Amino acid sequence: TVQFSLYYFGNYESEFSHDKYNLLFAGAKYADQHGFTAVWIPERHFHAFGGFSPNPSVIAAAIARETKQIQIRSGSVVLPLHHPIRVVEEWSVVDNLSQGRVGISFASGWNPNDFALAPQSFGNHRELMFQGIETVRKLWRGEFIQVQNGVGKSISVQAFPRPMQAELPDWITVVNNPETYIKAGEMGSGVLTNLMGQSIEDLAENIALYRESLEKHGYNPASGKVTVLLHTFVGQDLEQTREIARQPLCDYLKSSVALFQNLVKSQGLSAAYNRYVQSSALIGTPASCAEVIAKLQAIGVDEVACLIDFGVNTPAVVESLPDLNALRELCQ
Amino acid sequence: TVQFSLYYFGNYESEFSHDKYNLLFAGAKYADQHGFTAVWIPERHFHAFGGFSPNPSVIAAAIARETKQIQIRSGSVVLPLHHPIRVVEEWSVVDNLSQGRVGISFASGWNPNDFALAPQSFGNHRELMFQGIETVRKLWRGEFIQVQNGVGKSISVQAFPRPMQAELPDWITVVNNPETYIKAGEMGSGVLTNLMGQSIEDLAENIALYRESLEKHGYNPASGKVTVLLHTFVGQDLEQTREIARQPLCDYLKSSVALFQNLVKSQGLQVDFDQMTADDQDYILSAAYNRYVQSSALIGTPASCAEVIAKLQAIGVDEVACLIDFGVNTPAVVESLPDLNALRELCQ
């Protein structure tokens, strides 16, 4: 059966809210107490919109002290924006603070403006990401790595504190690139994806390639991790729930040319939206959304990461949490 | 009256302990509930010893959710090892998670091994720090700054989330360099210092330059912040308390040539370090320790330590940051927290 998790885009009620983490903690605590698998948090820079998490390790440390069982995962460390040493250090802090509940999905970045944080790392940043993942994994295990120090001497260092998990649960963030699904299987990593920029049919084929590459490289296919972000807002009445979600979700999908056109292409505008919310989101009733979960389960999705903070007002999202729990129970 | 705060070196019980933050949360919660002003957390890299905080913003975010009033401060953010943008971003997250309780002391770094994290930033790190503090302040205040993006284009960015505090409470980490005290006064910043490598009269002199530079540059003297790190272990029996702290503290004070020689020098002892044998160091370190706990630490009884607090209050110290995790076993440190509270009560 599919695992149910929460996912945060990073939104809050206002740029100048006194309680910017209102929905973050309300949802994470609710999910923690109701058998949800993980809470996913992002990395975003330089925009008020979606900006509560410029470094997910910092938010994760706070979630660790407010929850007891839920996994605390990054829906995406943009690795070329960090030194790999700091990624292991900070997430090992969170691993200790949470008694072993962290996981990381790694993304390469794409916006050169984000690389204000790493101005010499844009261009070959995808290659830099895969290199850094190997470093992150080695440091996490406890091995020494070799690095240049401040006077040009090569030194050997370990990262501290040591984590509690022997091995870092990790994912590769991907959209539709089949090579990346294959690379993830070669690495034994999971895949973290979405249905905004690929069809369900494209997803089914990409999962199959990923699981093929997993066994080809000796990993048990049970160790595969397929996680799909899905826009989520669940209620008791289908049409009323859809209408509450419509303006906030449309606003986002129209906010950029890429989002707008990646949607219309992955769907085959109010026309792309109506197909999107029916087939590639969890917006509706437990019963209507369960049909989507059934399709995703049948093509090999292990975990749905329910993006709940896409713009619907916080009281309504909080009121919708027992409806989302009902969906989870329907699908167990 | 002097403010009382806790300060963490970053130690924990064993390398693979499942409860590495045992004393961190025990002390932070205790201090939060007993009238302490702040808890200070460090930045340290590449060693288990003192290593639970490689980036203090992450630990600070957790302390924010475990405490209600205490300030949550870094002693120190080694600013040349960070992009200033990440410092404002991460500490603004903590400012929001804590309802406005953060503060930062900035250090420049000194060990080239730490600069594995910033391999082109060693050499210019003191000026990099001061330049970075100004960037941090501008960003905290909601200004845009100009930075080069990944394709060489200049762009104008703000940092998010926006903080809760209008202005960041900040300090400069300093030992005995008088120009740094004067520099801090020019910036209106605080100073965070220690007595491992200077005298109380040296500190009194450095404090005077700092307060003089403050009003010179238009700041109210009441805006000055003088915080002194002090090794701390308080108990009811003077002799037993100093004996409990002796081996842990002396192990630390002789763990490097600089630590040992700066201690011997600051305690007024005459030693030819080139002829000093292993047995000699035993006698010298014991003498240096004995002078140090008498004059420059909080290791003893509430009554004995209150004499030290009085001398610090007189020379203008605002806050003592009590370093409690220098190696005494954790249960004894926990049992010593109410003795430290008794000392705070005595001094208000």
UniProtKB/TrEMBL annotation, chain A:
It is found in: Cytoplasm. Signal peptide: none annotated. Belongs to the ATP-dependent AMP-binding enzyme family. This is PuwE. The lineage of its organism: Bacteria, Bacillati, Cyanobacteriota, Cyanophyceae, Nostocales. The gene is puwE.
